[PDB]
Coordinates of C-alpha atoms in Angstrom, one line a residue:
Chain A
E1 CA -82.3 -14.8 -75.8
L2 CA -84.9 -12.2 -74.8
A3 CA -87.0 -13.6 -77.7
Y4 CA -89.1 -16.7 -76.8
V5 CA -90.2 -15.7 -73.3
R6 CA -93.4 -14.5 -71.7
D7 CA -92.5 -12.6 -68.5
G8 CA -89.8 -12.1 -65.9
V9 CA -89.8 -11.0 -62.3
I10 CA -86.5 -10.3 -60.7
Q11 CA -86.9 -9.9 -56.9
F12 CA -84.4 -8.9 -54.2
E13 CA -84.1 -8.1 -50.5
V14 CA -82.0 -5.8 -48.2
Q15 CA -81.3 -5.8 -44.5
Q16 CA -83.3 -3.5 -42.1
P17 CA -81.4 -1.0 -39.9
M18 CA -81.5 -1.7 -36.2
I19 CA -78.4 -0.6 -34.2
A20 CA -77.5 -2.2 -30.9
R21 CA -80.2 -1.2 -28.4
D22 CA -80.7 -0.2 -24.7
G23 CA -82.9 -1.9 -22.0
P24 CA -85.0 -4.7 -23.3
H25 CA -88.7 -5.3 -24.1
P26 CA -90.5 -7.6 -26.7
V27 CA -90.4 -6.0 -30.1
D28 CA -91.0 -8.8 -32.7
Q29 CA -88.2 -7.9 -35.0
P30 CA -89.3 -8.2 -38.7
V31 CA -88.5 -10.9 -41.2
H32 CA -87.8 -9.4 -44.6
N33 CA -89.1 -6.9 -47.2
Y34 CA -89.3 -8.8 -50.5
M35 CA -90.4 -6.3 -53.1
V36 CA -91.0 -7.3 -56.7
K37 CA -91.1 -5.5 -60.1
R38 CA -91.9 -6.2 -63.7
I39 CA -90.5 -6.2 -67.2
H40 CA -91.8 -4.0 -70.1
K41 CA -90.6 -5.0 -73.6
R42 CA -90.4 -2.8 -76.7
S43 CA -88.6 -2.8 -80.1
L44 CA -87.9 -0.4 -83.0
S45 CA -86.5 -0.5 -86.5
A46 CA -85.1 1.5 -89.4
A47 CA -85.9 1.6 -93.1
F48 CA -83.2 1.3 -95.8
Chain B
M1 CA -96.9 -22.0 -20.7
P2 CA -99.5 -20.7 -23.1
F3 CA -102.4 -22.8 -24.3
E4 CA -102.4 -23.0 -28.1
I5 CA -105.0 -23.5 -30.8
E6 CA -104.7 -24.8 -34.4
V7 CA -107.1 -23.4 -37.0
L8 CA -105.3 -25.0 -39.9
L9 CA -106.9 -24.3 -43.3
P10 CA -107.4 -27.5 -45.3
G11 CA -106.3 -27.9 -49.0
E12 CA -109.5 -27.1 -50.8
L13 CA -109.3 -23.5 -52.0
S14 CA -106.6 -21.6 -53.8
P15 CA -103.7 -20.0 -52.0
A16 CA -104.8 -16.6 -53.4
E17 CA -107.1 -16.2 -50.3
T18 CA -104.6 -17.4 -47.7
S19 CA -102.1 -15.0 -49.2
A20 CA -104.7 -12.3 -49.0
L21 CA -105.6 -13.1 -45.4
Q22 CA -101.9 -13.1 -44.6
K23 CA -102.4 -9.3 -44.3
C24 CA -104.9 -9.8 -41.4
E25 CA -102.2 -10.4 -38.7
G26 CA -102.9 -9.0 -35.2
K27 CA -106.7 -9.4 -35.7
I28 CA -108.8 -10.7 -32.8
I29 CA -111.2 -13.7 -32.9
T30 CA -113.1 -15.3 -30.1
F31 CA -113.9 -19.0 -30.1
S32 CA -117.4 -20.3 -29.1
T33 CA -116.1 -23.4 -27.3
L34 CA -112.7 -24.7 -26.2
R35 CA -110.4 -27.6 -27.2
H36 CA -106.9 -28.1 -28.5
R37 CA -108.1 -28.0 -32.1
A38 CA -110.4 -25.9 -34.3
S39 CA -111.1 -25.1 -37.9
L40 CA -112.7 -22.7 -40.3
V41 CA -116.3 -23.7 -39.9
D42 CA -116.0 -23.2 -36.1
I43 CA -114.9 -19.6 -36.0
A44 CA -117.0 -18.4 -38.9
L45 CA -120.4 -16.7 -39.1
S46 CA -121.9 -20.1 -39.8
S47 CA -120.8 -20.9 -36.3
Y48 CA -122.4 -17.7 -35.0
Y49 CA -125.9 -18.4 -36.5
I50 CA -129.0 -18.9 -34.5
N51 CA -132.2 -20.6 -35.9
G52 CA -130.4 -20.4 -39.3
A53 CA -130.9 -16.6 -39.0
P54 CA -128.0 -14.1 -38.8
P55 CA -128.1 -12.5 -35.4
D56 CA -128.3 -8.7 -35.3
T57 CA -126.0 -6.3 -33.5
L58 CA -127.7 -6.9 -30.2
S59 CA -127.9 -10.7 -30.7
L60 CA -124.2 -10.5 -31.7
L61 CA -123.4 -8.8 -28.4
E62 CA -124.8 -11.2 -25.8
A63 CA -123.1 -14.1 -27.6
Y64 CA -119.6 -12.7 -27.7
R65 CA -119.4 -12.7 -23.9
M66 CA -119.6 -16.5 -24.0
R67 CA -116.7 -17.1 -26.4
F68 CA -113.0 -17.3 -25.6
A69 CA -110.5 -14.6 -26.4
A70 CA -107.8 -15.4 -29.0
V71 CA -105.3 -13.4 -31.1
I72 CA -103.6 -14.4 -34.4
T73 CA -100.0 -13.8 -35.4
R74 CA -99.0 -16.5 -37.9
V75 CA -100.6 -17.9 -41.1
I76 CA -98.4 -20.9 -41.8
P77 CA -98.1 -22.2 -45.5
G78 CA -100.3 -25.0 -44.2
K79 CA -101.9 -24.0 -40.9
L80 CA -102.5 -21.0 -38.6
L81 CA -101.6 -20.8 -34.9
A82 CA -103.5 -18.7 -32.4
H83 CA -103.0 -18.2 -28.6
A84 CA -105.8 -18.6 -26.0
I85 CA -106.0 -15.0 -24.6
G86 CA -109.0 -15.2 -22.3
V87 CA -107.4 -17.2 -19.5
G88 CA -103.9 -18.2 -20.8
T89 CA -100.8 -16.5 -19.3
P90 CA -98.5 -15.4 -22.1
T91 CA -95.3 -13.5 -21.1
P92 CA -95.1 -11.9 -24.6
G93 CA -96.9 -8.6 -25.2
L94 CA -99.6 -9.9 -27.5
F95 CA -99.3 -7.9 -30.8
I96 CA -102.7 -6.8 -32.1
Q97 CA -103.8 -4.3 -34.8
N98 CA -106.1 -1.3 -34.4
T99 CA -108.5 -1.7 -37.3
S100 CA -111.2 0.6 -35.9
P101 CA -110.9 4.2 -37.0
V102 CA -109.9 5.7 -33.7
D103 CA -106.3 6.9 -33.1
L104 CA -104.3 5.3 -30.3
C105 CA -101.9 6.7 -27.7
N106 CA -100.1 4.8 -24.9
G107 CA -102.5 3.7 -22.2
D108 CA -105.9 3.0 -23.7
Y109 CA -108.2 0.3 -22.5
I110 CA -109.3 -1.6 -25.6
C111 CA -112.5 -3.6 -25.9
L112 CA -114.4 -5.7 -28.5
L113 CA -117.6 -5.1 -30.5
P114 CA -119.3 -6.1 -33.8
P115 CA -119.6 -4.7 -37.3
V116 CA -119.5 -0.9 -37.1
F117 CA -118.5 2.4 -38.8
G118 CA -119.4 1.9 -42.4
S119 CA -117.1 -0.6 -44.1
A120 CA -114.8 -3.4 -43.0
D121 CA -113.0 -6.4 -44.4
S122 CA -115.3 -9.3 -43.7
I123 CA -114.0 -11.8 -46.3
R124 CA -115.9 -14.8 -47.6
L125 CA -114.7 -18.1 -49.2
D126 CA -115.3 -19.5 -52.6
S127 CA -115.2 -23.3 -52.5
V128 CA -116.7 -24.1 -49.1
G129 CA -118.1 -20.6 -48.6
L130 CA -117.4 -19.7 -45.0
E131 CA -117.9 -16.2 -43.7
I132 CA -115.6 -15.2 -40.8
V133 CA -116.6 -12.1 -38.8
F134 CA -114.0 -9.9 -37.1
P135 CA -115.0 -8.0 -34.0
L136 CA -113.7 -4.5 -34.6
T137 CA -111.1 -3.5 -32.0
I138 CA -111.8 -0.3 -30.2
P139 CA -111.0 1.5 -26.9
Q140 CA -113.4 1.6 -23.9
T141 CA -114.8 5.1 -23.7
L142 CA -116.5 5.3 -27.1
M143 CA -117.9 1.9 -26.4
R144 CA -119.3 3.0 -23.1
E145 CA -121.0 5.7 -25.2
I146 CA -122.2 3.4 -28.0
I147 CA -123.9 1.1 -25.5
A148 CA -125.9 4.0 -24.2
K149 CA -126.7 5.1 -27.8
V150 CA -127.8 1.6 -28.8
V151 CA -130.1 1.2 -25.8
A152 CA -131.3 4.7 -26.8
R153 CA -132.8 3.2 -29.9
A154 CA -133.7 -0.1 -28.2
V155 CA -136.1 1.9 -26.2
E156 CA -137.8 2.9 -29.5
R157 CA -137.7 -0.4 -31.5
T158 CA -140.1 -2.0 -29.0
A159 CA -141.9 1.0 -27.5
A160 CA -142.8 2.5 -31.0
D161 CA -126.2 7.7 -34.4
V162 CA -123.2 10.0 -34.9
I163 CA -120.6 10.3 -32.2
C164 CA -117.9 12.9 -31.8
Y165 CA -114.2 12.5 -31.0
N166 CA -111.0 14.0 -32.4
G167 CA -113.3 16.1 -34.5
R168 CA -114.6 13.0 -36.2
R169 CA -118.4 12.4 -36.4
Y170 CA -119.2 8.8 -37.5
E171 CA -122.4 6.8 -37.4
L172 CA -123.4 3.4 -36.0
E173 CA -125.6 0.9 -37.7
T174 CA -128.5 -1.1 -36.3
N175 CA -130.7 -3.3 -38.6
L176 CA -134.4 -4.1 -38.1
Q177 CA -135.0 -5.4 -34.6
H178 CA -136.3 -8.6 -33.3
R179 CA -139.1 -8.4 -30.6
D180 CA -136.7 -10.3 -28.3
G181 CA -134.5 -7.2 -28.0
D182 CA -137.4 -8.1 -23.7
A183 CA -133.7 -8.9 -23.5
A184 CA -132.6 -5.3 -23.6
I185 CA -134.9 -3.3 -21.3
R186 CA -134.7 -6.0 -18.6
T187 CA -131.1 -5.1 -18.1
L188 CA -132.0 -1.6 -16.7
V189 CA -135.2 -2.5 -14.8
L190 CA -132.6 -4.6 -12.9
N191 CA -129.9 -2.0 -13.1
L192 CA -132.0 1.0 -12.1
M193 CA -134.3 0.1 -9.2
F194 CA -131.6 -1.5 -7.1
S195 CA -129.6 1.7 -7.4
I196 CA -132.3 3.5 -5.4
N197 CA -133.7 2.6 -2.0
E198 CA -135.2 4.1 1.2
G199 CA -132.0 6.0 1.9
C200 CA -132.6 8.0 -1.3
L201 CA -135.6 10.0 0.0
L202 CA -133.1 12.4 1.6
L203 CA -131.6 12.8 -1.8
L204 CA -134.5 14.9 -3.2
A205 CA -134.0 17.6 -0.5
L206 CA -130.5 18.8 -1.4
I207 CA -131.4 19.3 -5.1
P208 CA -132.1 23.1 -5.0
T209 CA -128.4 23.5 -4.2
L210 CA -127.4 22.9 -7.8
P211 CA -128.1 4.8 6.3
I212 CA -127.6 6.6 3.0
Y213 CA -124.0 5.6 3.3
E214 CA -125.2 2.0 2.7
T215 CA -126.9 3.1 -0.6
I216 CA -123.6 4.7 -1.7
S217 CA -121.7 1.4 -1.3
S218 CA -124.1 -0.8 -3.2
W219 CA -124.9 1.8 -5.9
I220 CA -121.3 1.9 -7.1
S221 CA -121.0 -1.9 -7.2
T222 CA -123.9 -2.2 -9.6
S223 CA -122.6 0.9 -11.5
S224 CA -119.5 -1.0 -12.5
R225 CA -121.5 -3.9 -14.0
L226 CA -124.0 -1.8 -16.0
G227 CA -121.3 -1.5 -18.6
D228 CA -119.9 -5.0 -17.9
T229 CA -123.2 -6.9 -18.0
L230 CA -124.7 -4.9 -20.8
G231 CA -121.3 -4.4 -22.7
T232 CA -118.0 -6.1 -23.4
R233 CA -115.0 -6.4 -21.1
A234 CA -111.6 -5.0 -22.0
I235 CA -109.0 -7.7 -22.3
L236 CA -105.7 -5.9 -23.2
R237 CA -104.0 -2.5 -22.8
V238 CA -101.6 -0.5 -24.7
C239 CA -97.9 -0.4 -23.6
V240 CA -95.4 0.8 -26.2
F241 CA -91.8 1.0 -25.2
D242 CA -89.6 2.6 -27.9
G243 CA -92.1 3.6 -30.6
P244 CA -94.3 6.5 -31.5
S245 CA -96.8 8.2 -29.2
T246 CA -99.2 8.3 -32.2
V247 CA -100.5 4.9 -33.1
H248 CA -103.1 5.3 -35.9
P249 CA -106.0 3.1 -37.0
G250 CA -104.9 0.2 -39.2
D251 CA -101.5 -0.3 -37.6
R252 CA -100.1 -3.1 -35.5
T253 CA -99.8 -2.5 -31.7
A254 CA -98.1 -4.3 -28.8
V255 CA -100.7 -4.8 -26.0
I256 CA -100.7 -7.1 -23.0
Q257 CA -103.6 -9.1 -21.4
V258 CA -105.2 -7.3 -18.5
Chain C
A1 CA -100.9 -25.3 -86.1
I2 CA -97.6 -23.9 -84.7
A3 CA -97.6 -20.4 -83.4
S4 CA -95.2 -17.7 -84.6
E5 CA -92.2 -16.4 -82.7
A6 CA -91.6 -20.2 -82.3
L7 CA -91.8 -20.8 -86.0
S8 CA -89.6 -17.6 -86.2
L9 CA -86.7 -19.9 -85.6
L10 CA -88.1 -22.6 -87.9
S11 CA -88.5 -20.3 -90.9
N12 CA -84.7 -19.9 -90.9
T13 CA -82.0 -20.2 -88.2
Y14 CA -79.7 -17.2 -88.1
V15 CA -78.1 -19.0 -85.2
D16 CA -74.6 -19.9 -86.5
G17 CA -73.5 -22.4 -83.8
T18 CA -74.8 -20.6 -80.7
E19 CA -72.6 -21.0 -77.7
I20 CA -75.5 -22.3 -75.6
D21 CA -77.0 -25.2 -77.6
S22 CA -79.3 -26.5 -74.8
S23 CA -81.3 -23.3 -74.2
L24 CA -83.7 -22.8 -77.0
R25 CA -82.7 -25.8 -79.2
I26 CA -84.0 -28.7 -77.0
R27 CA -87.1 -27.4 -75.2
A28 CA -88.5 -26.2 -78.6
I29 CA -87.5 -28.9 -81.1
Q30 CA -88.4 -31.8 -78.9
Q31 CA -91.7 -30.2 -77.7
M32 CA -92.8 -29.8 -81.2
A33 CA -91.4 -33.0 -82.6
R34 CA -93.7 -34.9 -80.2
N35 CA -96.6 -33.6 -82.2
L36 CA -94.8 -34.0 -85.5
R37 CA -94.8 -37.7 -84.5
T38 CA -98.3 -37.9 -83.3
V39 CA -99.6 -36.5 -86.6
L40 CA -97.9 -39.4 -88.3
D41 CA -99.5 -41.8 -85.9
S42 CA -102.8 -40.1 -86.8
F43 CA -102.8 -41.5 -90.3
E44 CA -101.1 -44.7 -89.2
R45 CA -104.1 -45.2 -86.8
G46 CA -107.1 -44.0 -88.7
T47 CA -106.9 -46.9 -91.2
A48 CA -108.1 -49.5 -88.8
Chain D
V1 CA -123.4 -22.8 -56.5
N2 CA -121.6 -20.8 -59.2
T3 CA -119.8 -24.0 -60.3
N4 CA -123.0 -25.1 -61.9
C5 CA -121.7 -23.3 -65.0
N6 CA -118.0 -24.0 -64.2
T7 CA -118.5 -27.6 -65.4
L8 CA -120.5 -29.8 -67.6
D9 CA -120.5 -33.2 -65.8
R10 CA -119.9 -32.7 -62.1
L11 CA -122.5 -35.3 -61.1
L12 CA -119.8 -37.9 -60.5
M13 CA -117.7 -36.3 -57.8
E14 CA -120.4 -34.6 -55.7
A15 CA -121.9 -37.8 -54.2
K16 CA -118.9 -39.4 -52.4
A17 CA -118.4 -37.9 -48.9
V18 CA -121.0 -35.2 -48.4
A19 CA -120.9 -34.7 -44.6
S20 CA -123.4 -36.3 -42.2
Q21 CA -126.8 -34.8 -41.8
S22 CA -128.3 -36.0 -38.5
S23 CA -127.6 -37.2 -35.0
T24 CA -125.7 -40.4 -34.8
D25 CA -126.1 -41.4 -31.1
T26 CA -129.1 -39.5 -29.9
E27 CA -132.2 -41.2 -28.5
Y28 CA -134.2 -39.6 -31.3
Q29 CA -133.6 -38.1 -34.8
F30 CA -132.0 -34.7 -34.0
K31 CA -130.4 -32.1 -36.2
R32 CA -126.7 -32.6 -36.9
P33 CA -124.6 -31.1 -34.0
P34 CA -122.1 -28.8 -35.7
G35 CA -119.1 -30.7 -34.3
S36 CA -119.8 -33.6 -36.7
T37 CA -117.1 -35.1 -38.8
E38 CA -118.9 -37.9 -40.6
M39 CA -118.8 -37.7 -44.5
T40 CA -121.2 -40.4 -45.4
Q41 CA -123.0 -41.6 -48.5
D42 CA -126.5 -40.6 -49.8
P43 CA -127.9 -42.0 -53.1
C44 CA -131.3 -40.3 -52.8
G45 CA -129.8 -36.9 -51.9
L46 CA -128.4 -36.9 -55.4
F47 CA -131.2 -38.2 -57.6
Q48 CA -134.0 -36.8 -55.3
Chain E
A1 CA -88.4 -14.3 -19.4
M2 CA -86.1 -11.6 -18.0
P3 CA -87.3 -8.7 -15.8
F4 CA -87.8 -5.1 -16.7
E5 CA -85.8 -2.3 -15.1
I6 CA -86.2 1.5 -15.3
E7 CA -83.5 4.1 -14.8
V8 CA -84.4 7.6 -13.7
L9 CA -82.6 10.9 -13.4
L10 CA -81.5 12.5 -10.1
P11 CA -80.1 16.0 -9.3
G12 CA -76.5 16.8 -8.5
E13 CA -74.8 18.9 -5.8
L14 CA -77.5 18.0 -3.2
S15 CA -77.7 18.0 0.6
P16 CA -76.9 15.1 3.0
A17 CA -80.2 15.9 4.8
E18 CA -82.8 14.9 2.2
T19 CA -80.6 12.1 0.9
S20 CA -81.1 10.2 4.1
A21 CA -84.9 10.6 3.7
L22 CA -84.4 9.1 0.2
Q23 CA -82.4 6.2 1.7
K24 CA -85.3 5.7 4.2
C25 CA -88.0 5.5 1.4
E26 CA -87.4 2.0 0.0
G27 CA -90.3 -0.2 -0.8
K28 CA -92.9 2.5 -1.5
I29 CA -95.3 2.4 -4.5
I30 CA -95.4 5.0 -7.3
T31 CA -97.1 5.2 -10.7
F32 CA -95.6 5.9 -14.1
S33 CA -97.1 7.3 -17.3
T34 CA -95.2 5.7 -20.1
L35 CA -92.7 2.8 -19.7
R36 CA -89.5 4.4 -21.0
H37 CA -85.9 3.4 -20.0
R38 CA -85.2 7.2 -20.2
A39 CA -87.8 8.9 -18.0
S40 CA -86.8 11.8 -15.8
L41 CA -87.5 12.2 -12.1
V42 CA -89.8 15.1 -12.9
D43 CA -91.7 12.7 -15.1
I44 CA -93.0 10.8 -12.1
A45 CA -93.7 13.8 -9.8
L46 CA -96.8 16.0 -9.4
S47 CA -95.0 18.4 -11.7
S48 CA -95.7 15.8 -14.5
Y49 CA -99.3 15.3 -13.3
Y50 CA -101.8 17.6 -15.0
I51 CA -100.9 21.0 -13.6
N52 CA -103.5 23.6 -14.6
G53 CA -102.3 26.1 -12.1
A54 CA -103.4 23.9 -9.2
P55 CA -102.4 20.2 -8.9
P56 CA -104.7 17.9 -10.8
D57 CA -107.7 16.7 -8.8
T58 CA -107.2 13.4 -7.0
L59 CA -110.2 12.1 -8.9
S60 CA -108.4 12.5 -12.2
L61 CA -105.2 11.3 -10.4
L62 CA -107.0 8.1 -9.5
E63 CA -108.1 7.9 -13.2
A64 CA -104.5 8.3 -14.2
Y65 CA -103.2 5.7 -11.7
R66 CA -105.8 3.4 -13.2
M67 CA -104.5 4.3 -16.6
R68 CA -100.8 4.7 -15.5
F69 CA -98.4 1.9 -14.8
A70 CA -96.6 1.5 -11.4
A71 CA -93.2 0.8 -10.0
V72 CA -92.0 -0.9 -6.8
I73 CA -88.7 0.5 -5.4
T74 CA -85.9 -1.6 -4.0
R75 CA -82.4 -0.8 -2.6
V76 CA -81.2 2.6 -3.9
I77 CA -77.7 3.1 -5.2
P78 CA -76.9 6.5 -3.5
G79 CA -75.7 7.9 -6.8
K80 CA -78.9 7.0 -8.7
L81 CA -82.2 5.2 -8.3
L82 CA -82.9 1.5 -9.1
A83 CA -86.6 0.3 -9.0
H84 CA -88.4 -2.7 -10.4
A85 CA -91.3 -1.8 -12.6
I86 CA -94.6 -3.6 -12.1
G87 CA -98.0 -3.9 -13.7
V88 CA -96.9 -5.7 -16.9
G89 CA -95.8 -9.2 -15.6
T90 CA -92.1 -8.8 -15.2
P91 CA -90.6 -12.3 -14.8
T92 CA -89.6 -13.6 -11.3
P93 CA -88.0 -10.7 -9.5
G94 CA -87.8 -10.8 -5.7
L95 CA -90.7 -8.3 -5.2
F96 CA -90.8 -6.9 -1.7
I97 CA -92.6 -3.8 -0.5
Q98 CA -92.6 -1.2 2.3
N99 CA -96.3 -0.9 3.3
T100 CA -97.4 2.7 3.0
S101 CA -100.4 2.5 5.3
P102 CA -101.4 3.4 8.9
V103 CA -103.8 0.4 9.1
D104 CA -103.0 -3.2 9.9
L105 CA -102.7 -5.7 7.1
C106 CA -103.1 -9.5 7.0
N107 CA -101.1 -12.0 4.8
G108 CA -102.6 -13.5 1.7
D109 CA -105.0 -10.6 0.8
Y110 CA -105.2 -8.2 -2.1
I111 CA -103.9 -4.7 -2.6
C112 CA -104.9 -1.7 -4.7
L113 CA -104.1 2.0 -4.6
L114 CA -106.2 5.0 -3.7
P115 CA -105.7 8.7 -3.8
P116 CA -103.7 9.9 -0.8
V117 CA -106.2 12.0 1.1
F118 CA -104.7 12.1 4.6
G119 CA -101.3 13.8 4.4
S120 CA -98.4 14.4 2.0
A121 CA -95.6 14.6 4.7
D122 CA -94.4 11.2 3.4
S123 CA -93.2 13.0 0.3
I124 CA -89.7 14.5 -0.3
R125 CA -89.7 18.3 0.0
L126 CA -86.6 18.9 -2.2
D127 CA -86.7 22.7 -2.0
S128 CA -83.2 22.8 -3.5
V129 CA -84.8 22.4 -6.9
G130 CA -88.3 23.7 -6.3
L131 CA -90.2 20.6 -7.6
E132 CA -92.2 18.1 -5.5
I133 CA -93.1 14.5 -5.9
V134 CA -96.2 13.0 -4.1
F135 CA -96.7 9.4 -3.2
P136 CA -99.9 7.2 -2.6
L137 CA -101.2 4.9 0.2
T138 CA -101.9 1.2 0.1
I139 CA -105.2 -0.5 1.1
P140 CA -106.9 -3.9 0.6
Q141 CA -109.5 -4.1 -2.1
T142 CA -112.1 -5.5 0.3
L143 CA -112.3 -2.0 1.9
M144 CA -111.8 0.6 -0.8
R145 CA -115.5 0.7 -1.3
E146 CA -116.0 1.8 2.3
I147 CA -113.0 4.1 2.2
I148 CA -114.6 6.2 -0.5
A149 CA -118.2 5.8 0.7
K150 CA -117.4 7.1 4.2
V151 CA -115.8 10.3 3.0
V152 CA -118.6 10.9 0.4
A153 CA -121.2 10.3 3.0
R154 CA -119.5 12.8 5.3
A155 CA -119.1 15.4 2.5
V156 CA -122.7 15.2 1.3
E157 CA -123.9 16.3 4.7
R158 CA -121.5 19.2 5.1
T159 CA -122.0 20.5 1.5
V160 CA -115.0 4.6 11.3
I161 CA -112.7 2.1 9.6
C162 CA -111.5 -1.2 10.9
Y163 CA -109.2 -4.1 9.9
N164 CA -107.7 -6.9 12.0
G165 CA -108.7 -4.9 15.1
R166 CA -107.7 -1.3 14.2
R167 CA -110.2 1.5 15.1
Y168 CA -109.3 4.5 13.0
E169 CA -111.5 7.5 12.3
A170 CA -110.2 20.6 -2.7
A171 CA -110.0 17.3 -4.6
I172 CA -112.2 15.8 -1.9
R173 CA -115.1 18.2 -2.7
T174 CA -115.0 18.0 -6.5
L175 CA -115.8 14.3 -6.7
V176 CA -119.5 14.9 -6.2
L177 CA -119.4 17.6 -8.9
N178 CA -120.1 14.7 -11.4
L179 CA -121.8 12.2 -9.1
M180 CA -124.9 13.5 -7.2
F181 CA -127.2 13.9 -10.2
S182 CA -126.7 10.4 -11.7
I183 CA -129.0 8.8 -9.1
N184 CA -131.7 11.5 -9.2
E185 CA -131.6 10.9 -13.0
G186 CA -132.4 7.3 -12.3
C187 CA -135.3 8.3 -10.0
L188 CA -136.6 10.4 -12.9
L189 CA -135.9 7.8 -15.6
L190 CA -138.0 5.2 -13.7
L191 CA -141.0 7.5 -14.2
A192 CA -139.9 8.8 -17.6
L193 CA -139.9 5.4 -19.3
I194 CA -142.7 3.8 -17.3
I195 CA -136.1 11.4 -24.3
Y196 CA -133.8 10.0 -27.0
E197 CA -131.1 12.7 -26.8
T198 CA -131.2 12.4 -23.0
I199 CA -130.2 8.7 -23.0
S200 CA -126.7 9.7 -23.8
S201 CA -126.2 11.0 -20.2
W202 CA -127.4 8.4 -17.7
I203 CA -126.0 5.1 -19.1
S204 CA -122.8 6.7 -20.2
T205 CA -122.0 8.5 -16.9
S206 CA -123.0 5.3 -14.9
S207 CA -120.5 3.2 -17.0
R208 CA -117.9 6.0 -16.7
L209 CA -118.2 6.4 -12.9
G210 CA -118.8 2.9 -11.7
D211 CA -115.7 1.2 -13.0
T212 CA -113.1 3.7 -11.6
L213 CA -114.2 2.7 -8.1
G214 CA -114.5 -1.0 -9.1
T215 CA -110.8 -1.5 -9.8
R216 CA -109.0 -4.8 -9.9
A217 CA -106.4 -6.3 -7.6
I218 CA -102.8 -6.1 -8.8
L219 CA -100.9 -7.2 -5.6
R220 CA -101.1 -9.9 -3.0
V221 CA -98.9 -10.1 0.1
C222 CA -97.0 -13.2 0.9
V223 CA -94.0 -13.9 3.2
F224 CA -92.4 -17.3 3.0
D225 CA -89.5 -16.7 5.5
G226 CA -90.2 -14.1 8.1
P227 CA -93.0 -12.1 9.6
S228 CA -96.7 -13.0 9.1
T229 CA -98.5 -9.8 9.9
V230 CA -97.4 -6.2 9.2
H231 CA -97.9 -3.0 11.0
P232 CA -97.1 0.5 9.5
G233 CA -93.6 0.5 8.2
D234 CA -92.1 -3.0 7.6
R235 CA -90.3 -5.0 4.9
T236 CA -92.8 -7.7 3.8
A237 CA -92.4 -9.7 0.6
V238 CA -95.3 -10.0 -1.8
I239 CA -96.4 -11.7 -5.1
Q240 CA -97.1 -9.9 -8.4
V241 CA -100.8 -9.8 -9.4

């Protein structure tokens, strides 16, 4: 049922690359990325 | 053991603004007084008013030296936590952002000053309507020049702006003056005459080449406070470990209290 | 009034025993039947 | 305030706890020190 | 809250003559440009100071040392170097020092560096590679004013120091090349005021040239278990900042 709806946002996340490291220091490693997108609905038909 | 401040935002306005000010991490505020709690009406322009009048660039400079240094890192879904940077002793390297349009390398000496350059992100509020001001974060050299160039017009506003670096030539703004800006020229009438003495009469004899030892020792001491008493004091310094040697305006930095 | 693309199912139901009978059958029929009851209460009430 | 056309009858809610307006322990009648928390009542300050 | 350690490069196939001098230089003070766990030995030498044909002037060298970080050296592992970096606030290492000064020093006072203007024999002349590293002095901040003022007063006429009971008497000449006129300009400005494009010189040069000689204190000396006063060349413990 993609019929009686208004809008839909499907979001995701992926890890961020950071290999094992050398001598230490404060870095404040990140938290996430969290991008979002949209949906765009269309439709067609044919005459017979 | 770092002293901590709470500037929790109450539940009046819509989260569309706290979500928008989420992007303002690493921005530097400076609290007028000190206590273990604070709020929005206390670190806003409404807190910086005098006589109900908005202070000008000069009147916004002598006041900053009385408030306490603080940086922001977290805007909690309910509150906002900031560290006391003026006197506190934090072992982390306090992460700040370089909003001012001047490129950064490793080893600057960053300072604080008011609304400059042309356009900034001074955001208001809708419901309670509180205007918070953000001292643009710059390095020390161009500030040592802007203080000269602002006294340069101070000596006209009572008695009667484009700076160059990295090939960039940008202006500096100064509104109509108050007659009090009395306050400005007194700083040099103090800073000039004490830098000359009896031992300086020998000085005008060696000029066609281009006890005096006492006048050299005292002259340098005051010379260090001409920019300190008439300007701002640098509080942090750039130290990047495993990043890029080109830190641009608008990007987060990892600096440590001086 | 009842808006279209919701009356699209009420004009006729091409659903021939859909496998998911709780998806668009409850949250539509009940939501509208509430007002189909209140309109009856309207005339029941206006007499007094 | 721009809400003066965002409503029709706001009179009711805007006279409950408008914050204090003056000194509360001073030896005279001073202007409200900014660190005041009192949200008091004021009939006159509504009807003028 | 764990310390910070730097690892530097060292040459190979060396002589057992200079290596003893390296094993003798433990506790001296040296500046660093950028804190990097991979920074070569040439990175901290005069070779990596601003060579423009001649070594960079000790005025700009002082400016660098004020803008550069620093490192205190401890026991050397003869294969490599091991030194504890300072200036940032490294958490609780056992900071000691070898005092690089010919003047007496008391306990509980402050320390800040100054350009080495007496002699560079305390360097390591590694002529096996052709590159030289130069090291500074150490002085209390209550005296740096006088240390610069005496030499500039001597040099203005051509062109004593004491502490705890010690009677001691190129880049030195170029310091006044940006200094002498800033006070004549004040003499002239007193009359000029009681124009606009001139203001950009006096204030700016005063603020640029007053601070570099008004540095802050980054080291205090303190011995809990051992000697109280130091003479040139001893192993005294200290405190950071």
